[PDB]
Design a protein around this motif. Sequence first.
Motif, PDB file in Angstrom:
ATOM      1  N   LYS A 124      -2.144   0.953  -4.968  1.00 27.46           N
ATOM      2  CA  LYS A 124      -1.643  -0.141  -4.129  1.00 27.46           C
ATOM      3  C   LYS A 124      -1.595  -1.403  -4.994  1.00 27.46           C
ATOM      4  CE  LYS A 124      -4.539   1.904  -2.185  1.00 27.46           C
ATOM      5  NZ  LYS A 124      -5.686   2.502  -2.920  1.00 27.46           N
ATOM      6  N   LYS A 128       0.819  -1.210   0.000  1.00 25.30           N
ATOM      7  CA  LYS A 128       0.000   0.000   0.000  1.00 25.30           C
ATOM      8  C   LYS A 128       0.855   1.263   0.000  1.00 25.30           C
ATOM      9  CE  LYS A 128      -0.941   0.396   4.931  1.00 25.30           C
ATOM     10  NZ  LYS A 128      -2.056   1.297   5.346  1.00 25.30           N
ATOM     11  N   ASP A 129       0.193   2.408   0.011  1.00 22.36           N
ATOM     12  CA  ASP A 129       0.900   3.685   0.041  1.00 22.36           C
ATOM     13  C   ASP A 129       1.775   3.882  -1.198  1.00 22.36           C
ATOM     14  OD1 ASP A 129      -0.201   4.331   2.548  1.00 22.36           O
ATOM     15  OD2 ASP A 129       1.379   3.202   3.578  1.00 22.36           O
ATOM     16  N   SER A 176      -4.326   6.665  -3.586  1.00 25.83           N
ATOM     17  CA  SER A 176      -2.997   6.164  -3.883  1.00 25.83           C
ATOM     18  C   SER A 176      -3.063   4.800  -4.570  1.00 25.83           C
ATOM     19  CB  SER A 176      -2.177   6.006  -2.605  1.00 25.83           C
ATOM     20  OG  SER A 176      -1.826   7.251  -2.049  1.00 25.83           O
TER      21      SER A 176
HETATM   22 BR   LIG Z   1      -2.759   3.198   0.090  1.00 28.16          BR
END
Ligand SMILES: [Br-]
Length: 131
Positions: A95, A81-82, A93
Motif C-alpha cells: 500500500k 491500499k490493495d 499487499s
Molecule cells: Br492493502
Amino acid sequence: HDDCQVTNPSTGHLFDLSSLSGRAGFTAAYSEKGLVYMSICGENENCPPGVGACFGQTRISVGKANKRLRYVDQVLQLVYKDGSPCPSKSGLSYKSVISFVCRPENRPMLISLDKQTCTLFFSWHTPLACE
Ligand SMILES: [Br-]
Ligand SMILES: [Br-]
Ligand SMILES: [Br-]
Ligand SMILES: [Br-]
C-alpha cells in the motif's frame, strides 16, 4: 466527503489537492535507479487500470487510487491500499501512504518502505498543505 478535499475540523480551513490530479501525475525516486509513478486522487496512466501508484520498472501496483483525503495533526494524507501481493509469508499487499505537509513557499518523495507491512511512505512538502 472523499473528493480530494478535506477540512481541518477545528478551524474549518478547506484543503484541496485537486490541482495535483491528472493521469500524467508524477514520479518519486526509488532506490538507485528506479522510480514510482503516482497520480493524486485518481489512477496513473503509466500504471495498470485503477492503480494510483506503481513501480516504474515493472508497473506492479503499490496501491489503488482513491480520493479519500484525510486530515490529521496538520498533515493531509492519502492511503492507496490493495496493491499487489508483496514478498510476504502471511499474504500482505503493498500500500502507499502519501503525506502532504505544509511548505509556505512540489515533487513527492519516498522516505520509507516498511518491509514489515509492505507500506511505502511518501512525503510531499507543498503550500497546498498550509493554513
Ligand atoms: Br492493502
Ligand atoms: Br522501479
Ligand atoms: Br479514484
Ligand atoms: Br520528509
